[PDB]
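Colleagues,

Please find the record for the two-part complex below.
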Amino acid sequence: TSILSIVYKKDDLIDLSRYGAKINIGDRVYYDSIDKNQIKLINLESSTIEVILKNAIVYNSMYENFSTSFWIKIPKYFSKINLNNEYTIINCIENNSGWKVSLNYGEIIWTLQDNKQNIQRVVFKYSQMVNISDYINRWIFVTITNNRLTKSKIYINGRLIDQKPISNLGNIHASNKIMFKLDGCRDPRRYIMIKYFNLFDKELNEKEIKDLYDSQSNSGILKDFWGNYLQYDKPYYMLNLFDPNKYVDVNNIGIRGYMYLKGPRGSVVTTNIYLNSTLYEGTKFIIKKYASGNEDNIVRNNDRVYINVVVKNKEYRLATNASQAGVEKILSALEIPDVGNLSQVVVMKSKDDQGIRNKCKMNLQDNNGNDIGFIGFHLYDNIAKLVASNWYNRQVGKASRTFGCSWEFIPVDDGWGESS
Amino acid sequence: MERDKYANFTINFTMENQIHTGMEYDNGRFIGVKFKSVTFKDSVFKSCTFEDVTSVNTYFKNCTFIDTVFDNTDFEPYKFIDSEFKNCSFFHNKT
């Protein structure tokens, strides 16, 4: 199935396919420190990756089906220089035939061109005028399939987005090189991140695409809001997914104080370019390693941790007295040396009981291993206090919907652009 | 025919019963201000900060805000009439 499968190896990129594609990488291509398969391309002629395909696999046909998949992270577009500016990012066009991926303001575009210079395109569009976007500056899994007798199709996160008939196109004779490079982008500050580029010699079906998505998602590792691996000892701003218009706050330090959800959350705006909630709000959370024997700094499903809460630049410990009366246990921020035997061990969750990937949860436990509850919130006189509550766990155990115990962890990221 | 400029200032007083037109405010700080019956018209605000501000019967009409922050204000959308923002932010809104 695979005819090109690019992964990171040794400060370098290689092809795992049988065809051993030659890959020439320019001066100013960068790999992420945490996930080295996340490749960053900037807006400079030296930031290039050139893949040379063997002749045997150059696309030259009226008929062969083919697909590509890859992950991409696209920074927010900030200003009018980004409007109405299509720029190529992955180019397999030679002598005005072949294929390419290009971007534009709120768009991912796939273009096929035949040897009469007939063109068909499919497009994914996303809005920047949304309080919380599923796409802006977040990892997105792209899959494009092509059936020469039917349609080109674009999938995003395993879901069919756009399709167009391509029986108008004759022979397509693509390049024997693929160039990964920002090409024709007028924003000097633009970049992209990409991961796991693949080429397949068929039209992938829906199930194949979903399995690729699930597989390459690493569902045993928790993710931050951007789609990166969640990490120990790294400050995160917290978003409650059920009530995104609030941020976490602490009224007082200590067991007589409490953590709660305060609103309203702010906004960042450029008229007609973007209008989003601010993300860098509330008392930051820092996940501290406790029981994991993993030597790396990544947070895994079922890791037992502590949570540090930052209040005016000082770290306190998220804890509760599970003996307080009622199923819902109100959470406090305690002096780290005053925690005593209060309950503070948290089980981090990236997937449910049947192994289905889902949004981050935190299951607070006592020091005997009994569940005290997933962390969500409850209203006490109109104040939305953070609580650990076993009702949540019972809902989870029954497959029922939960409300307020699903969280995103948001670190500061240079593709988002808000001030902290 | 440029706008009249006022720059690198801090205003922390009660501003009332007045209209400002064709002004450019650059790197201005409005901190602890009460506005009452004030209108800014056809004015530009660059790298300004409004912090802890209340406003009664106060509007910005045909104004442009660039790199400007509104922190702990009561500025709702209806206070901006025919105006525009470039890389601005609101937060800690009052009430």
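The interface with chain A takes residues 69, 84-93 of chain B (CB under 8 Å).

Comments are welcome before we finalize the supplementary table.
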